[PDB]
Structure formats: structure tokens, C-alpha cells
mmCIF file of C-alpha atoms (C1' of nucleotides) in Angstrom:
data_model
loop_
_atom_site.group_PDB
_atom_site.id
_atom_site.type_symbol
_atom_site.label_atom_id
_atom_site.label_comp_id
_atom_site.label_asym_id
_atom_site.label_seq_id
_atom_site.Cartn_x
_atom_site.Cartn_y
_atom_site.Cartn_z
ATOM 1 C CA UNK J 15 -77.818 93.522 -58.842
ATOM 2 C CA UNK J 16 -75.938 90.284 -58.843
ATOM 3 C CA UNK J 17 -76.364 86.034 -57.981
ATOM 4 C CA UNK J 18 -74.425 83.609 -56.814
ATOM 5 C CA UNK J 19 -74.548 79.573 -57.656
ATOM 6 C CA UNK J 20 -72.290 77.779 -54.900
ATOM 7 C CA UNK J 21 -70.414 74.873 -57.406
ATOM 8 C CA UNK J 22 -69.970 71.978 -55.591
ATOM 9 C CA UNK J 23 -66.741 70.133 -55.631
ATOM 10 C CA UNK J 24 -68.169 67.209 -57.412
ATOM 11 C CA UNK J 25 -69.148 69.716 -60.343
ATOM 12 C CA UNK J 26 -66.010 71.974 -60.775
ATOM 13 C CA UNK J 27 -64.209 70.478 -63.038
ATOM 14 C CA UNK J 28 -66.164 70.348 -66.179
ATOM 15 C CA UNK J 29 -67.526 73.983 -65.211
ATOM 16 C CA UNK J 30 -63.907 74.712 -66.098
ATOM 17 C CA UNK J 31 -63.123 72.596 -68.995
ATOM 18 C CA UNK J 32 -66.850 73.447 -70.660
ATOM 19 C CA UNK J 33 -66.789 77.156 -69.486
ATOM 20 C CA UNK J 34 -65.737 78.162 -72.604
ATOM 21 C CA UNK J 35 -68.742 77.346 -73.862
ATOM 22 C CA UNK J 36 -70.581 78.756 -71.296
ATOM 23 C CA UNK J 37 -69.774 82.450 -70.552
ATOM 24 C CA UNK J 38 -70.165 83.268 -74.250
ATOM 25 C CA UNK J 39 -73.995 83.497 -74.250
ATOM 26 C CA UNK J 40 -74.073 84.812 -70.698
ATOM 27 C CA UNK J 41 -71.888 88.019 -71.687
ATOM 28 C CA UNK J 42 -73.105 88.148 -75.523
ATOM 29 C CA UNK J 43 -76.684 86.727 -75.837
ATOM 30 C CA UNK J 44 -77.599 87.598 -72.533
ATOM 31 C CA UNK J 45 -75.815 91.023 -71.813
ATOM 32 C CA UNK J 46 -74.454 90.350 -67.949
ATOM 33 C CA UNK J 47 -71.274 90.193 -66.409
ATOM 34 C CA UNK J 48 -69.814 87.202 -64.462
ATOM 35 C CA UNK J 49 -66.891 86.091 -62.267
ATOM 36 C CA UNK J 50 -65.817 82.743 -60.899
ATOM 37 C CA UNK J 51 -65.180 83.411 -57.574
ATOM 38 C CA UNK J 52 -62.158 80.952 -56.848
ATOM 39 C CA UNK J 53 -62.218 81.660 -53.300
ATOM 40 C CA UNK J 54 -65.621 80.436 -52.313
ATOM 41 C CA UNK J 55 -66.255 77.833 -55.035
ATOM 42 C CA UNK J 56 -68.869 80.540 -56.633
ATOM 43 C CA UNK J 57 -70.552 82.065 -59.923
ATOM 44 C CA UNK J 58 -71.209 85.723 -59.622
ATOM 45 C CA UNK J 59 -73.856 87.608 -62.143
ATOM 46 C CA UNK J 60 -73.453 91.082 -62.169
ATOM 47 C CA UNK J 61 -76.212 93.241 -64.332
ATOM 48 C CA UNK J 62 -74.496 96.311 -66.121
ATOM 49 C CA UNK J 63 -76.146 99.723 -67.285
ATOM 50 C CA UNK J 64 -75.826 98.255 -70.608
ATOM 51 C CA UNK J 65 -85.550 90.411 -66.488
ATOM 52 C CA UNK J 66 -82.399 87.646 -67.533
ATOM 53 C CA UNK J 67 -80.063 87.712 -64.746
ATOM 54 C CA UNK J 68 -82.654 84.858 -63.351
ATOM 55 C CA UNK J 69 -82.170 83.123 -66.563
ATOM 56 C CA UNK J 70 -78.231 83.026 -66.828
ATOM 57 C CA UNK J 71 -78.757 81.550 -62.495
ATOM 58 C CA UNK J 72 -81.199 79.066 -64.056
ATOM 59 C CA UNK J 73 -78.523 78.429 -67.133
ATOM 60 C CA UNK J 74 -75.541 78.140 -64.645
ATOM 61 C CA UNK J 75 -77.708 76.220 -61.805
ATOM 62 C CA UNK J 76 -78.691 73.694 -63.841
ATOM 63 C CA UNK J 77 -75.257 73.133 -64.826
ATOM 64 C CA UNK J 78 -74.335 73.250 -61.277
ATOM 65 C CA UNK J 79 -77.453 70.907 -60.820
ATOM 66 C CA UNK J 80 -75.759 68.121 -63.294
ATOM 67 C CA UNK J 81 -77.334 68.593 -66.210
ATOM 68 C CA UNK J 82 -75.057 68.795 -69.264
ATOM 69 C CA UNK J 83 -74.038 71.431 -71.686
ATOM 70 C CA UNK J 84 -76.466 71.143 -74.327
ATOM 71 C CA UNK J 85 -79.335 70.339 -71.604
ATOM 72 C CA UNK J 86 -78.335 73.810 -70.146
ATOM 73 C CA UNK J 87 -78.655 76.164 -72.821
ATOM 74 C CA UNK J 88 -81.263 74.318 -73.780
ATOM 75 C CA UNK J 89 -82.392 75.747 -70.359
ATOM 76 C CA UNK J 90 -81.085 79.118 -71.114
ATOM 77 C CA UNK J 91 -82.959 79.610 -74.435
ATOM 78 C CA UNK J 92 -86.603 77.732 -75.016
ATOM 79 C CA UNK J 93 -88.903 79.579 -72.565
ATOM 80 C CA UNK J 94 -91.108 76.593 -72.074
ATOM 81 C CA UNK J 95 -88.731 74.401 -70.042
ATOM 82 C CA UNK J 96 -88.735 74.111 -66.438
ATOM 83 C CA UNK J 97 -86.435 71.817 -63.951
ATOM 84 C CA UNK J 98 -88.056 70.286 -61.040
ATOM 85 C CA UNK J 99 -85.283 68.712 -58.264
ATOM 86 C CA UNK J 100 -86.384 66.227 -54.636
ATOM 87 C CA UNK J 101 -85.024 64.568 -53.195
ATOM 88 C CA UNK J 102 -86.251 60.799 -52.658
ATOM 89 C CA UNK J 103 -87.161 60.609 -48.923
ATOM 90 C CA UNK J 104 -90.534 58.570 -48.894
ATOM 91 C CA UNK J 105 -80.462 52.899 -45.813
ATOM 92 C CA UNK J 106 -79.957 49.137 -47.341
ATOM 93 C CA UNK J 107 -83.903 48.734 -48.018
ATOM 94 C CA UNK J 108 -85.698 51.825 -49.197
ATOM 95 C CA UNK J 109 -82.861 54.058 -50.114
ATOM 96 C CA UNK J 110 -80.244 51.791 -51.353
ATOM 97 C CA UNK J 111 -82.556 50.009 -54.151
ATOM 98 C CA UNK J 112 -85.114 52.975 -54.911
ATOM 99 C CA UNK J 113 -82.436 54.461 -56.599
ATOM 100 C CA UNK J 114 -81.614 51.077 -58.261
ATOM 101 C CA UNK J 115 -84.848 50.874 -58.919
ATOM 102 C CA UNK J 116 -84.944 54.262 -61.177
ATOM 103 C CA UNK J 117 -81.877 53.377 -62.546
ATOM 104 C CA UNK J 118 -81.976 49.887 -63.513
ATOM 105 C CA UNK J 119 -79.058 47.720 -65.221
ATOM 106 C CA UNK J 120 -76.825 50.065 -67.555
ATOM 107 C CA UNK J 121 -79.362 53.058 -66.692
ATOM 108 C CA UNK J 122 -82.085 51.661 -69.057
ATOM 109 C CA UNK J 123 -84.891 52.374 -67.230
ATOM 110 C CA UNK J 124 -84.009 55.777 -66.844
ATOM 111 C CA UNK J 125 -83.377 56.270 -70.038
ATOM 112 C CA UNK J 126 -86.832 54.911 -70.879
ATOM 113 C CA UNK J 127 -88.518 57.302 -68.859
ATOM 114 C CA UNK J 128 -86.249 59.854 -70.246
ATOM 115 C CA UNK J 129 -87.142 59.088 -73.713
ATOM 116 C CA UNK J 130 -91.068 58.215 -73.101
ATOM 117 C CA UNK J 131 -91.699 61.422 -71.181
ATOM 118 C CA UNK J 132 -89.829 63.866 -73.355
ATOM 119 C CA UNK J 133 -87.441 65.009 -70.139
ATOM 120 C CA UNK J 134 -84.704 64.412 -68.867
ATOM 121 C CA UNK J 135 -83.694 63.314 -65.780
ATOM 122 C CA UNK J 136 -79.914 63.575 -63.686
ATOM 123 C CA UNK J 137 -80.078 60.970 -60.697
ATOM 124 C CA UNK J 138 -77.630 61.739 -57.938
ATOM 125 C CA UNK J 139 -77.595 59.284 -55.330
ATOM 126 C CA UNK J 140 -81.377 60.551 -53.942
ATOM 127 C CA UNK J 141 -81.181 63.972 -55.519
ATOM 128 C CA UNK J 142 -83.513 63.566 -58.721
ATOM 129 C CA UNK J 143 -83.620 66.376 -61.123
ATOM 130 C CA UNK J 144 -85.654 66.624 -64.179
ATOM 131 C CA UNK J 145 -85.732 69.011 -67.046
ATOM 132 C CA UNK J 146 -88.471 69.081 -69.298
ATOM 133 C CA UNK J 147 -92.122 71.028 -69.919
ATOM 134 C CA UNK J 148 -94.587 71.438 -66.986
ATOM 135 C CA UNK J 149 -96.859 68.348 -68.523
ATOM 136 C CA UNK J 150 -93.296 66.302 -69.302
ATOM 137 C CA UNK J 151 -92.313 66.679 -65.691
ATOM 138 C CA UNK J 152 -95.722 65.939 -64.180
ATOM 139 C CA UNK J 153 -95.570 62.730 -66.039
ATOM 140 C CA UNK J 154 -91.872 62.143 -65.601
ATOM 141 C CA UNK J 155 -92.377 62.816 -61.536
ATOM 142 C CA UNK J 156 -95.679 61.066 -61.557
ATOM 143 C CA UNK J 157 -93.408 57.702 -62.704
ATOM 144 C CA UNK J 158 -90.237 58.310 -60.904
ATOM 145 C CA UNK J 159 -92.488 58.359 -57.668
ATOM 146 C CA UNK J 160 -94.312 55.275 -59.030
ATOM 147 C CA UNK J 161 -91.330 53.056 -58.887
ATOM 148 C CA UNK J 162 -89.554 54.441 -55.734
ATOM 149 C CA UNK J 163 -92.973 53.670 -53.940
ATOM 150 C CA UNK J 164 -93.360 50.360 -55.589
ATOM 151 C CA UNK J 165 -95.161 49.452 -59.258
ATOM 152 C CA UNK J 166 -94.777 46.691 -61.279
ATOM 153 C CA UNK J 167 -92.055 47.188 -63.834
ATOM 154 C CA UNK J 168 -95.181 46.505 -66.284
ATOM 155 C CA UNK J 169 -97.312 48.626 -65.216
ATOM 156 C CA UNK J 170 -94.619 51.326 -65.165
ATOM 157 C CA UNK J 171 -93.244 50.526 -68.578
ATOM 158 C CA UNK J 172 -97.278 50.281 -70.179
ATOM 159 C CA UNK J 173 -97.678 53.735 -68.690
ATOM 160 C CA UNK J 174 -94.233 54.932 -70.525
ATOM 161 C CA UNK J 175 -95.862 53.527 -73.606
ATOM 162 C CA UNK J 176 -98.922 55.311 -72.926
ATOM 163 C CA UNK J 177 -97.648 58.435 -71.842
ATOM 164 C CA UNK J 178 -95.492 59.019 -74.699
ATOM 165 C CA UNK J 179 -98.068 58.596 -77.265
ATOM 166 C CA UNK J 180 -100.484 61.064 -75.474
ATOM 167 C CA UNK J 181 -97.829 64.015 -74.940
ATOM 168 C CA UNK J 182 -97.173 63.209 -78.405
ATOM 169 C CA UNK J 183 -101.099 63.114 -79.551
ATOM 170 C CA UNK J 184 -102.940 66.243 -80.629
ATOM 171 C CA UNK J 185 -106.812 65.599 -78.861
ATOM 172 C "C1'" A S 19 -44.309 -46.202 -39.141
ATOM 173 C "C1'" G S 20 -44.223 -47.208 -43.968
ATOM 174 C "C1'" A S 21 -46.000 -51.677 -47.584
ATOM 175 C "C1'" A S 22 -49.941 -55.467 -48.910
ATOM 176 C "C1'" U S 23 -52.017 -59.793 -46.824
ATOM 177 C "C1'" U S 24 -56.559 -56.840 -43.693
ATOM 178 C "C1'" U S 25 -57.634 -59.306 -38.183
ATOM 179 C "C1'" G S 26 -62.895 -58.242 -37.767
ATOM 180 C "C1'" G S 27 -65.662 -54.616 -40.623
ATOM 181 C "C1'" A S 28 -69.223 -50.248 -38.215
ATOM 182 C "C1'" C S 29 -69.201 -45.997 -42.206
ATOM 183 C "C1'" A S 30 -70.141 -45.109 -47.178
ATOM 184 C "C1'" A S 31 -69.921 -40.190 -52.197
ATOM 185 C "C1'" A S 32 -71.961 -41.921 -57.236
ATOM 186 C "C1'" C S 33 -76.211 -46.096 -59.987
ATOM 187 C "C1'" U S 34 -81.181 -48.582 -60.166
ATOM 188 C "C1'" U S 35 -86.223 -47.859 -58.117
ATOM 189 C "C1'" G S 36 -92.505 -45.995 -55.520
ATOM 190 C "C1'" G S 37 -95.026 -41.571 -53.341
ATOM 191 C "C1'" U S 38 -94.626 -35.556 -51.545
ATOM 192 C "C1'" C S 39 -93.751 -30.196 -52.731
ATOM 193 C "C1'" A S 40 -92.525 -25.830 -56.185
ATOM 194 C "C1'" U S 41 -91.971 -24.830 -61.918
ATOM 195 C "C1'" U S 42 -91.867 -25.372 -66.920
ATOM 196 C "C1'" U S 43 -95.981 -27.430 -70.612
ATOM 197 C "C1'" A S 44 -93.614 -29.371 -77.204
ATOM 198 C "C1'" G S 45 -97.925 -27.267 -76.667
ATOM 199 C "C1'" A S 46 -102.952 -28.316 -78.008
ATOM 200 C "C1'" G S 47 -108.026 -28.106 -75.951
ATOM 201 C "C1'" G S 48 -112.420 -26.309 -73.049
ATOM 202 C "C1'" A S 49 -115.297 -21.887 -71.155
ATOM 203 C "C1'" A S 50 -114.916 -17.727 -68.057
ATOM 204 C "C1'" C S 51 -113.999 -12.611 -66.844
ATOM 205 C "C1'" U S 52 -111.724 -7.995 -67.714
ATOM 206 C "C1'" A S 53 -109.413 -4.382 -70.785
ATOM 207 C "C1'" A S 54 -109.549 -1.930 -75.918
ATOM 208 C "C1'" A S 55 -108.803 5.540 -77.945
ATOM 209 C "C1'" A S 56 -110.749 9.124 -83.588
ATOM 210 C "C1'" G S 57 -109.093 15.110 -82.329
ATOM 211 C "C1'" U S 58 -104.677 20.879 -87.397
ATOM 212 C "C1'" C S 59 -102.616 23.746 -84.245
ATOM 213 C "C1'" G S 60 -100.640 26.156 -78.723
ATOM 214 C "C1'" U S 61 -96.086 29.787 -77.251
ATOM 215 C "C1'" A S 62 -90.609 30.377 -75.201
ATOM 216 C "C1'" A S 63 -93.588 30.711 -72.242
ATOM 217 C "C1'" C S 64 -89.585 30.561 -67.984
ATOM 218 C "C1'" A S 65 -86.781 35.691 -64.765
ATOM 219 C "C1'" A S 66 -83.740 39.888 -61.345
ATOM 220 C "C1'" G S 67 -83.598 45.437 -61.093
ATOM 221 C "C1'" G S 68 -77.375 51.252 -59.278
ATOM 222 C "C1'" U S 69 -77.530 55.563 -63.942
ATOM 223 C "C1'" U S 70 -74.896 60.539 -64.143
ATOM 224 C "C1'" U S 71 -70.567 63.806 -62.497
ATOM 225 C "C1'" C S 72 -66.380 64.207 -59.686
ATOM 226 C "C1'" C S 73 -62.487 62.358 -55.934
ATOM 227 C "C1'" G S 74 -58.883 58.779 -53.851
ATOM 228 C "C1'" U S 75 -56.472 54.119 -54.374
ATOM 229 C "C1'" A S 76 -54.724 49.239 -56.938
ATOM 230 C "C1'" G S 77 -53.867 47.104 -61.623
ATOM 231 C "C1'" G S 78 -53.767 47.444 -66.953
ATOM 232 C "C1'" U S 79 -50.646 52.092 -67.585
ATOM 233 C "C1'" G S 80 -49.756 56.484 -74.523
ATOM 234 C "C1'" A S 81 -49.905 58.603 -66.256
ATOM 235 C "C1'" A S 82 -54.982 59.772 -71.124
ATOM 236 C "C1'" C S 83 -58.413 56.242 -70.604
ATOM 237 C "C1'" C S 84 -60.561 51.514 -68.789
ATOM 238 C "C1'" U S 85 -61.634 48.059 -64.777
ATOM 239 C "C1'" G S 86 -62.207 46.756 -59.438
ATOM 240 C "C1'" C S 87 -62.673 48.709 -54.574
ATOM 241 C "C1'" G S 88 -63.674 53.056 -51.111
ATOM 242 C "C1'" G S 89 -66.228 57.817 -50.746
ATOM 243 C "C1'" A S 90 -69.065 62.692 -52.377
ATOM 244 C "C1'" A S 91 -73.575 65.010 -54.662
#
RNA sequence: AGAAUUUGGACAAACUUGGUCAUUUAGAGGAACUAAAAGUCGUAACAAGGUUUCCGUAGGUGAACCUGCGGAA
């Protein structure tokens, strides 16, 4: 029983470089098998005679996804984490300044909501991906949606405040 | 045609000398109207929203990396 993660070619190149550090918990910590398929731009998991073959596709997806090295075995161990990708979808007007619009100038207001939210969030060019808790990526959605559908960059950034003190807040 | 006697002298800028119009009074009076300001400390209020990871190309190049432009997720 077996996976594969198509890597796109956009993504290939630091799979190689950083797959060093990858494989080792995928054929030590978790106890699988795995190929890079050179042929069709592929990761194969093979299970051996000797429930985490889903967790080394979610480990190498995410990296496949965008996310980093540290964000993905950050994936890979800590049970509690889940990664929630859409696209934008709701072109010079909408889709060419949404996007500007979650990024901001230098990425700041990503990294705000990155920071305020406890997630953390690749942006492709309309491909949004977020790691982070199930209550982190409600809140981290619940923004990202807020300012590609049009919010005051106060009101946005007073709910940040807000939402990072109650994640944060026990009752 | 010069020159002065002129040949006759109309014309005449500047100087005396009464009224008209505009303005200054050295200024001083009169008797009207209108106006008259007592309140620590108050700001930077003032404003837009292209990040990640590759790929090509031009330049700066230890051909690494950065920047600009063009694409991909």
C-alpha cells in the first residue's frame, strides 16, 4: 500500500536540496519506504511488513503545498495541526489586488495575520494555504476572506488584535 | 541769400492782477454718530495596499547572490 504527491516544477528544487532532511523521519521515525520517481515528477510511499503512511503524504504534501521545512515536520509530528488550501475565486480588479490585498507592502499584512492567528499562511498567486489548529484556521480563513471580499484595513487589523488575545485567553 | 537798418507789424512763451473747480489745513475749535474682546490646554491629526517558491532574460557579475522585466503555482 503506497501514495503518490505529484511535485510541481515550481517546487522541485528545494525538495532536492532539503531532502536530506526530509526522508530521514519518513524511513526512521515513521517506518515507510519512499522513492522519487524522476520520471513523472513524483513521491512514492511504500508501507513495509516492518495508520502513518497518510501522515508522511500530509508531511511531503505540504511541502509540495509550499510550506517550508520546519512548517512540515511540524506537520508531520504535533497531531493537532491541520492545513486548509482555496483557492480565491469570489483579472486586473478582483484577482489582481485581492491578492495584494492579503499581501500588502513587504508581506506585512500577511505576516500580521500570520502572527495574530497563530498559523501560517503560503500565498500563491490565488492558491491560499494555511497551517495551523482547527480554531487558528477558522480565524485565519474567517480574515483572509474578510479582506479579499472587502473590510476596512481597521476593522481587519482590530479583529487581529482581538483574535489573538482570545486564542491566547483561557475563559 | 546772408548781415543790420526793419518797410509796416498781425503773433507772442515768461511777470503783475479779480472770480470758478478739486486738495491739503500749521492746525485749533464745535457737536454728532458708530465701533471697542477676559478664556490653561487640543493632536500630527493628514494617507495607499503584491508576499512565498521556482523559471527565463538583461545588468551588477566571487556565474553565488541582488535588482529590473517576462512567466509558473
Amino acid at each position: 500500500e503506497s501514495r503518490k504527491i505529484m511535485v510541481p516544477p515550481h517546487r522541485m528544487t528545494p525538495l532536492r536540496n532539503s531532502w536530506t532532511k526530509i526522508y530521514p523521519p519518513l524511513v526512521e521515525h515513521l517506518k515507510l519506504q519512499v522513492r522519487m520517481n524522476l520520471k513523472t515528477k513524483s513521491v512514492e510511499l511504500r508501507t513495509n511488513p516492518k495508520g502513518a503512511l497518510q501522515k508522511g503524504a500530509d508531511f511531503i504534501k505540504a511541502f509540495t503545498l509550499g510550506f517550508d521545512l520546519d512548517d512540515s515536520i511540524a506537520l508531520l509530528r504535533l497531531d493537532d495541526l491541520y492545513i486548509e488550501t482555496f483557492e480565491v475565486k469570489d483579472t486586473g480588479d478582483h484577482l489582481s489586488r485581492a491578492i495584494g490585498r492579503i499581501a500588502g507592502k513587504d508581506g506585512k499584512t500577511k505576516f500580521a495575520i500570520e502572527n495574530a492567528t497563530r498559523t501560517r499562511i503560503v500565498l500563491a498567486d490565488s492558491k491560499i494555504h494555511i497551517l495551523g489548529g482547527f480554531t487558528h484556521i477558522r480565524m485565519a480563513r474567517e480574515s483572509v476572506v474578510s479582506l479579499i471580499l472587502g473590510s476596512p484595513p481597521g476593522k481587519v487589523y482590530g479583529n487581529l488584535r482581538t483574535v489573538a488575545s482570545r486564542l491566547k485567553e483561557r475563559y
